[PDB]
Write a protein that binds this ligand. Structure first.
Ligand code: WPO
Length: 652
């Protein structure tokens, strides 16, 4: 075979995992929406793509969402000029479909499981309580003069009220622009200025992993260079003394106390912007209302086989698109219970995730590979002794998942009884693009499998632009047609939007990842095209090599980048993080990096061997969990910021 799976210790003949009994409607579990085999997936998938899919999408749009005014046209526009349209004549409100209509049905039903940084301070937040706090904040925003189309910045930590902040902006037609609680004043500054918002929401302080976040302090430093900001709503999260600017800053609780607990919904056009999300100049991705909301609802319902009574647990942060889509809009659109996790995976201990699952009986869990590798690094005592039988599905998101981690996830977290869904997508896709449907697809470690409804992808040659037709091919991934949840522009920078995604390969959407469709049709996302290494003509993906390195005993996490090599063009350079146990004194470093080079030669090839390996305590990662390989590539070429100092030193 030309295309090989990500290196794994299990033989390929014993590495295919059919949907287990919890996803077969047995043991009293819900029957999956799509099942039981790959055929049942294509039968429905094929309805959602091609020129004959309008009828299907028109129905799902009316099945999934409540509409103030119905739509006439289903889709229009294209990539060329960035004029994507979906249900343009229709109107709705995001807050209504995430709150009101569910409050009217079961008001005492839990909407949010607020898992506070301290486990004892956790509680349930019903829809009634959530809708009421949302309407109060909306009325506060309206009292500040916020109008439909105005941008509002949200600098909130993972407290449950962040959902109220989001939905309050969408209730009145404003455009919220959420920023990671923890970002520096300079990063916050640039994002508050680009969106030109006049209102800012934040807390006095944040709490994560037992460490405080001086949100109001960082905000004060930022707003010194944000002239437009006139009003700041400050939430009392810790109650510790923080500076408050007279006139500009008002307390959340005191402002909401003056307002009613209901607020009418603004009638939004399908294509009115819902939010701006800036990606780490700053790129403010913009999403519309109807299309983004429909994509998050359908993906959640089908990719996680969500049912009315489930308790979905996405452990991401709302500063990330993963939180936007699968903490707030997605789950609450479907009217179920969702989790707001304020802590880390290892506070107070590396058992927190599992203490959480058994406490609330999470029916699905959804986190990043960087966290799965973290818990793997901490031993199996923290997880082995839990029940966790309430789970049915386990999700990975943010990067390629090494089969080694995929197995640990499958073994201990799911006790080999849960489906593993490797969900591939981007901030610019709005919702999950390629992922296995858990009740129908048999999984391969590290493979996203097949594309989701509305997504028709192709493998194109990166230079010629020709479609590699069929199986056992590899290249760069691209989409053939728009999908409902696709981003519509970059805020006040539609040229960057077209030049980044639409002009590289005229006719398609350009994700920026390498991909391979193996002999069975499974898709394999190998990493960022920018991270590809060209060793004497061979194109090495970062997932291939990293997955191989983590196959050696004691390896915790790895990151490989490229650098100029006179003989080979580029050479591979590896940054390796070893587990706590591994005694770096007893074992010669030279002998270790030599065993690793061999490990790569044996499974990949004699060209993928690193020309140099660096041992480091950690890796440069973003808040979401992405490994910042561009940094490592820049260094070799000459979150926790203190990790860059160790790299510049260990490399030099
Ligand atoms: C997850 C959504 C939000 O991610 P965002 O911050 O927009 O970054 C998107 C990128 O994450 C990678 N990526 C994400 N999921 C996967 C995945 N499942 N496998 C491999 N790479 C992945 C892949 O490079 C993609 O372009």
């Amino acid at each position: 075979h030309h295309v090989h799976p990500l290196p794994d210790s299990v033989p390929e003949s014993e590495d295919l995992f059919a949907p287990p009994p919890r996803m077969q409607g047995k043991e009293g579990r819900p029957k999956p929406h799509i099942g039981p085999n790959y055929e049942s997936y294509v039968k429905e998938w094929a309805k959602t793509v091609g020129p004959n899919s309008d009828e299907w999408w028109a129905a799902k749009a009316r099945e999934t969402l409540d509409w103030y005014d119905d739509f006439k046209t289903v889709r229009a526009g294209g990539f060329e000029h960035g004029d994507v349209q979906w249900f343009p004549e229709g109107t709705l409100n995001a807050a209504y479909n995430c709150l009101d209509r569910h409050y009217y049905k079961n008001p005492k039903k839990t909407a949010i499981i607020y898992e506070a940084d301290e486990p004892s301070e956790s509680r349930e937040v019903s829809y009634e309580e959530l809708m009421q706090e949302t309407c109060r904040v909306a009325n506060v925003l309206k009292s500040y003069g916020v109008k439909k189309g105005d941008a509002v910045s949200i600098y909130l930590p993972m407290t449950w009220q962040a959902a109220a902040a989001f939905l309050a902006c969408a209730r009145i037609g404003a455009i919220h622009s959420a920023v990671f609680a923890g970002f520096s004043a300079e990063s916050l500054r640039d994002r508050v200025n680009d969106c030109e918002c006049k209102v800012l929401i934040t807390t006095d302080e944040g709490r994560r992993g037992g460490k405080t976040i001086a949100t109001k302090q960082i905000v004060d430093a930022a707003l010194q260079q944000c002239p437009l900001v006139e009003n700041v709503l400050v939430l009392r999260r810790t109650g510790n003394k923080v500076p408050m600017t007279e006139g500009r800053d008002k307390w959340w609780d005191e402002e909401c106390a003056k307002m009613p607990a209901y607020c009418p919904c603004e009638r939004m056009a399908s294509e009115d912007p819902l939010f701006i999300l800036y990606t780490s100049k700053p790129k403010g991705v913009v999403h519309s209302t109807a299309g983004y909301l429909l994509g998050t609802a359908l993906t959640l319902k089908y990719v996680f086989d969500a049912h009315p009574d489930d308790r979905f647990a996405c452990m991401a942060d709302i500063g990330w698109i993963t939180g936007h889509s699968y903490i707030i809009y997605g789950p609450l659109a479907n009217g179920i219970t969702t989790a707001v996790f304020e802590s880390t995976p290892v506070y107070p201990t590396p058992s927190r995730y599992w203490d959480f699952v058994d406490k609330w009986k999470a029916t699905q869990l959804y986190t990043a590979p960087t966290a799965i590798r973290l818990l793997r690094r901490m031993g199996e005592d923290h997880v082995k002794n839990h029940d966790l039988s309430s789970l049915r599905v386990l999700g990975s998101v943010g990067e390629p998942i090494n089969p080694e981690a995929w197995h640990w996830y499958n073994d201990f977290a799911g006790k080999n009884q849960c489906a593993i869904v490797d969900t591939y997508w981007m901030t610019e896709t709005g919702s999950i693009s390629i992922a296995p449907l858990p009740g129908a697809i048999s999984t391969k470690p590290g493979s996203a499998t097949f594309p989701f409804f509305g997504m028709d992808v192709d493998i194109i040659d990166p230079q010629t632009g020709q479609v590699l037709e069929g199986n056992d091919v590899e290249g760069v991934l691209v989409a053939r047609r728009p999908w409902p949840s696709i981003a519509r522009t970059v805020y006040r920078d539609h040229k960057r939007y077209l030049e980044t995604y639409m002009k590289p390969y005229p006719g398609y959407f350009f994700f920026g990842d390498g991909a391979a469709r193996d002999y069975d049709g499974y898709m394999w996302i190998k990493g960022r095209v920018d991270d590809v290494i060209n060793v004497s003509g061979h194109r090495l993906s970062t997932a291939e090599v990293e997955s191989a390195l983590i196959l050696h005993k004691g390896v915790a996490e790895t990151a490989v980048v490229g650098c100029a090599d006179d003989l080979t063009g580029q050479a591979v350079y590896a940054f390796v993080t070893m587990k706590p146990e591994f005694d770096l004194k007893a074992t010669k470093e030279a002998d270790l990096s030599k065993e690793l080079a061999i490990q790569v030669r044996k499974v990949i090839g004699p060209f993928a061997a690193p020309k140099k390996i660096y041992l480091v305590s950690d890796l440069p990662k973003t808040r979401s969990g992405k490994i910042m390989r561009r940094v490592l590539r820049k260094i070799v070429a000459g979150a926790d910021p203190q990790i860059v100092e160790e790299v510049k030193q260990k490399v030099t």
